[PDB]
Amino acid sequence: MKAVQYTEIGSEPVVVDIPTPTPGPGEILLKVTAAGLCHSDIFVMDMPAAQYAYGLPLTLGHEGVGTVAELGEGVTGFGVGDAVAVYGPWGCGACHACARGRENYCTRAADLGITPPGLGSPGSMAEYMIVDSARHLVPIGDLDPVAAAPLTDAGLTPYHAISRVLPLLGPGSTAVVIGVGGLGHVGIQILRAVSAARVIAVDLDDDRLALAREVGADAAVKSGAGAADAIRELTGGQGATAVFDFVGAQSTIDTAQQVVAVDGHISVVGIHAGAHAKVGFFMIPFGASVVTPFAGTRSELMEVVALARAGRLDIHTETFTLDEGPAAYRRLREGSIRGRGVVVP
Amino acid sequence: MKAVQYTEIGSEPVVVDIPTPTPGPGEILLKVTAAGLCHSDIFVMDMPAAQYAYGLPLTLGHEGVGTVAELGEGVTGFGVGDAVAVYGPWGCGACHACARGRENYCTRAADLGITPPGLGSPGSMAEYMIVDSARHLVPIGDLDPVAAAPLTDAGLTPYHAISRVLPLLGPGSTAVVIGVGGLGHVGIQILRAVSAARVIAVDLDDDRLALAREVGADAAVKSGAGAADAIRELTGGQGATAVFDFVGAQSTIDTAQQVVAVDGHISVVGIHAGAHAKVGFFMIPFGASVVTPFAGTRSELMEVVALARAGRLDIHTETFTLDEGPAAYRRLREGSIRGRGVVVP
Amino acid sequence: MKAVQYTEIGSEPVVVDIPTPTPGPGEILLKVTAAGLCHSDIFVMDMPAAQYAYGLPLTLGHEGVGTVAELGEGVTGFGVGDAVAVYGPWGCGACHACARGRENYCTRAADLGITPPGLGSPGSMAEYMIVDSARHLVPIGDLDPVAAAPLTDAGLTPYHAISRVLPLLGPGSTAVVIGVGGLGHVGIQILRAVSAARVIAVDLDDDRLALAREVGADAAVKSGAGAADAIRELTGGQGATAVFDFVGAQSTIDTAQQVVAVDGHISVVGIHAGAHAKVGFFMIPFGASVVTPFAGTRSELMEVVALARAGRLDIHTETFTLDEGPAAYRRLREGSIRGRGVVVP
Amino acid sequence: MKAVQYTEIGSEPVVVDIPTPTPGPGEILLKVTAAGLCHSDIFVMDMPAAQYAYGLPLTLGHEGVGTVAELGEGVTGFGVGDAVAVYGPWGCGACHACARGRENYCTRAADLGITPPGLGSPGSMAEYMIVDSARHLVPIGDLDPVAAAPLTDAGLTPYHAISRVLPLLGPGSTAVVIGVGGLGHVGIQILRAVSAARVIAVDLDDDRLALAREVGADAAVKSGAGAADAIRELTGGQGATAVFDFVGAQSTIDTAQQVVAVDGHISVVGIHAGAHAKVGFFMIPFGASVVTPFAGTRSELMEVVALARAGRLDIHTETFTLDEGPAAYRRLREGSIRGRGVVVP
């Protein structure tokens, strides 16, 4: 089968021909219908040799949808041909966190050598992929695979970050979304569907502010030095109830601390090495909590899929072949994909 | 192997010799160390022939603990010899409820023909038992098996019922426990461990009021017509924040409605055919919710086990052999077991 | 001043001329701009003489909005001319419930002789009214008074009932609304604004099903014997996550019990003497809670007003003069007001 | 009357003779029975002249209990002689936060010139004090005033910090308490009363580790570089579910980040200028939230009082006269008071 792999340290990924795998007991083989491109795949390829420990070769792609091709021994609950999304952050399945479906916060996965697809285990950028367990598949019915692949991380991650503080986002609340890309443009639409919060979007690029307005933001403001004062002019001086930072650079976190309300929330979702919120007295308002969330829970992926099936999420994508995989990663590095890149085998 | 089975409709259970089973893919064989006796086994044996559909024969026992004897193909996460409790209310493992570990509220188990051990699938009253999946086992370490078997239902069910309204039970709150038997005497101890609620126990029998005080109730009162006024004398006339009725007879539910506070809770846990709360205006205080909960979640069983391991639960038991199984069920019918009956093979 | 009063037992209310009151210390005098008509005013007038204890005469109207006319001694936080809604369910202000703004569940108001406006204290169906305390006023800014008066009960009561179980109403959930009148037509719009639940409306009258669709219900079905099966055909057989019954007749509660999902909720909001849910095993699904809520909290009234100011609530009203008050109550008895009746002085 | 006042910038507080005040409309005069000494009074006296804006003179003491001496015009709900604790963080009483009793997070108090007693308004270190409003008094019944004064901040602040994440602290959880002084020794006892968490105390001083064990900590460990690993040896490697840092120095926050579990919580309660948590990827575990809470809510003070009345809180105090006030502040600066200092007029 054709696959896109990271083969040596520092080099760009290449297209290869490798064996189609076979499912052992409890496993499921999927024929891949769509694989998302995210910055997690870039992060893995930008590690120095001394820090890298995901193995070589590594099939990329941690966002994946497909159809069930073959069932391993003892697997029931799915038939051949069933369309399914892959739950990405694989946990042990047995700890207190995993027992509530919160495998994203599994306290044992590191020690057991359980790694997610595309980040240690083979990913979705191939004609076929193995899924370790039935509990990591979610049915998608007749949802278009191209629009569904982004739901497994571009949808799941913002959905989770929002869900952690949903009781704060009542009528009269304000939510700020910083960064209107793959994650951010889906986050705006989740906020509108599951809350009555007023939504203010922030980005560097005028074209991304246009995208923000297209997907339902109430206002959109230019990022940088003027952003904090512009956000406060919109909120009448009270501050934003919640800030969802999908950039996570030091300057965007600083903006978040300058606009968050007393008893509010900052969610640092975007990943920039070294950047951090400074949570201490006189540096942040009283009662304003801060967290770096990771991925999402099993039930949250099901809820994101239910939003898509009800017509509440317009996912903006650009489609690539497997041969175009390397080129699509270059496009992702330069920030020229409007929404989520998706590879179709 | 020796086992206690229901073999014909209307007759008492008998001791039999049947095949020791073999675990298929995904399954685990346990050597049973302790099996609890509950009223669910009685309910099953008291069904008329036209209503019964659990199959004959049926190995009894839906409360169970054991040691892992054999792993079926593909099972990891457990080694041979590991001491484990069985999670009883088996769900499909795939629906929204099951994805949060709430298999007690699985919306699909009926349609798929998934039945709990002792209530359609073979139970724990035997030398060995099959468990369908690794996710239905919880490690217990060096906990005494006899004191651990009751935790799987006598512990789990009250823990769940309490957990549904735990935020109501702050300092200054009052919780009433009606019925101090297998479930009720564990429920009192859970309330004391996980809340600052004042606990008032209610029973017909002076010996059970003594048990209530032994396990930490702040007061204990006689059941019947005078119970409502006696409870109100203890609460200064304000009413009880929550009432956990582990009897569920019409007279105890009536008492619960007469004592519950405004914005309080009644949990109807005990099962008496035909009995029901009457929830309407002028029949119950404003904002007082009522529910019939069932069993508990996976994470809740783990929490109950953590309470036992920390020394917070003194489980009162009487021990029987497998040969004494039929006799022990007669003892349970007449209400002469002080706490939970447990069979040890 | 002109006012509409209940003057003798069994008779219809009459228009009268009475003294304009003066505010004592802590009190505020409002010039009334709009007063809602609800069934609470009917209930008060339909009491037998032996049960009635609200005093005679009694100025009707427990839904009220106005402008601050005069401040009593020591009152700050409002200026003359400020537009305000009246928080209806007056509590003691000092107990545990009142300290969280939950004055609807005040445990002391009965014993202290604190009565709501229109139900023991003089109501809003007059040119002026006294409000006891500053904490019972909520600013409405430039909101149209006619559309704002219904918010104080037709808005507040459904908002509260929904808020009690909002975490259940995620994407993929279904909420059933029974009765599309004053409360029900606002309840549909609250569900759409603060959740992603699919909304199914139920009523006897085809004209009210039309109203339901106008205000955003996803489906609307005829009430009565066929309603349960019709609701289950729409939910694919799974049942409704929550049922909000704004009728509360025995037949509608029965329908609610036949459609509610496992681990769901029934809110009995409508008031029909004698009617009640029957909460017991085999009469309702496992884990399905039932409650009769009353009115709402202070913070909830503020949130309802914030929804109105954001344009999320289209309140259907018919306007009457004070002279037309008696006639408007006859219209309310026969069910010929489409939405909420409102009196404008 | 005698009082302890800050009279000029940079100087120590002095004992003075000033007028006994009279209560205006809505106000209550208390005869003070006990006044706590906290670091908030130190912070106020250590401000440079250009930053100080609380006025001179300033009567110190923001922890206070007393008996009602005189009622201002229009005040009901209290009789002369009633024993009461003062709710410290005075809010406007009208905003969304204040309507839920969360006056600690009032968004409007600054703009309205409402200041707490001892921090802008006259405090409790005097024979008498004015309280602005009846809603800022909580009845204490026959509680010893000396043990009750600390409850208003040493009790309230930890109770609030704990309450924000109480659902995380189930059986099997671990809570770390850093700093066993006024706040910390009460925080340990709250954790034991309202949760089943294992409690690990941390301090620099062996005498304070002894105090931790006296008030019910399950273990006590020396602070500094080895504290992290010592806490992990006690938790079997999993990390602490929640860390309550009542010191808030950079070294204790660093310790907190090294021990907190995935999906856990750090509460930075102690105040050290410049110190802060660093919340960013690779510096803190996934999902671990951080906050600086302030004081507590009205309902939380009531709950703390209910804990004291049930015998769940042993408050360690040292008693001083008003003449000893200045000396007692010197003792507080050098850290030589074992628990909470309390002044008795």
Ligand SMILES: NC(=O)c1ccc[n+]([C@@H]2O[C@H](COP(=O)([O-])OP(=O)(O)OC[C@H]3O[C@@H](n4cnc5c(N)ncnc54)[C@H](O)[C@@H]3O)[C@@H](O)[C@H]2O)c1
């Ligand atoms: N926490 C998690 O589990 C998780 C999961 C997935 C992705 N991520 C991270 O989220 C981030 C976003 O991912 P994506 O796929 O949506 O990225 P993307 O490239 O699709 O979009 C980036 C967007 O951010 C904007 N942007 C860049 N710098 C900005 C600034 N200073 N101010 C405002 N806007 C700015 C860009 O204009 C663009 O609109 C990445 O850092 C990624 O690593 C985190």
Ligand SMILES: NC(=O)c1ccc[n+]([C@@H]2O[C@H](COP(=O)([O-])OP(=O)(O)OC[C@H]3O[C@@H](n4cnc5c(N)ncnc54)[C@H](O)[C@@H]3O)[C@@H](O)[C@H]2O)c1
């Ligand atoms: N909802 C669930 O998931 C669930 C799970 C397990 C058991 N149950 C049910 O819980 C109930 C109790 O189970 P158990 O094993 O504790 O029973 P048990 O026989 O061990 O205990 C019964 C106790 O209730 C007391 N009692 C009986 N009638 C009473 C009355 N009118 N007033 C006060 N006290 C009275 C008895 O003296 C005894 O102490 C049963 O009805 C059982 O079927 C429900």
Ligand SMILES: NC(=O)c1ccc[n+]([C@@H]2O[C@H](COP(=O)([O-])OP(=O)(O)OC[C@H]3O[C@@H](n4cnc5c(N)ncnc54)[C@H](O)[C@@H]3O)[C@@H](O)[C@H]2O)c1
């Ligand atoms: N719990 C509370 O705090 C509270 C507060 C306010 C009102 N209420 C009660 O709520 C109820 C509704 O109040 P409202 O002012 O909206 O009434 P309304 O007269 O404005 O509307 C009643 C609606 O119910 C419909 N209806 C009647 N019988 C029905 C049936 N069997 N099935 C389906 N639909 C039916 C009617 O067609 C009508 O549209 C009243 O009983 C009132 O007393 C309760």
Ligand SMILES: NC(=O)c1ccc[n+]([C@@H]2O[C@H](COP(=O)([O-])OP(=O)(O)OC[C@H]3O[C@@H](n4cnc5c(N)ncnc54)[C@H](O)[C@@H]3O)[C@@H](O)[C@H]2O)c1
């Ligand atoms: N956030 C709030 O609302 C709030 C409210 C009240 C007090 N506070 C603050 O809380 C802190 C504690 O107040 P308190 O009155 O209990 O103080 P305290 O002086 O009574 O207690 C200090 C305790 O901390 C210990 N300690 C000091 N430095 C330490 C270190 N580096 N490592 C470990 N332990 C150390 C001491 O040995 C002592 O046990 C202060 O900073 C105070 O300003 C905050």
Ligand SMILES: [Zn+2]
């Ligand atoms: Zn990603």
Ligand SMILES: [Zn+2]
């Ligand atoms: Zn795990």
Ligand SMILES: [Zn+2]
């Ligand atoms: Zn049972």
Ligand SMILES: [Zn+2]
């Ligand atoms: Zn299921």
Ligand SMILES: [Zn+2]
């Ligand atoms: Zn009404």
Ligand SMILES: [Zn+2]
């Ligand atoms: Zn009250």
Ligand SMILES: [Zn+2]
């Ligand atoms: Zn303090």
Ligand SMILES: [Zn+2]
């Ligand atoms: Zn306020």
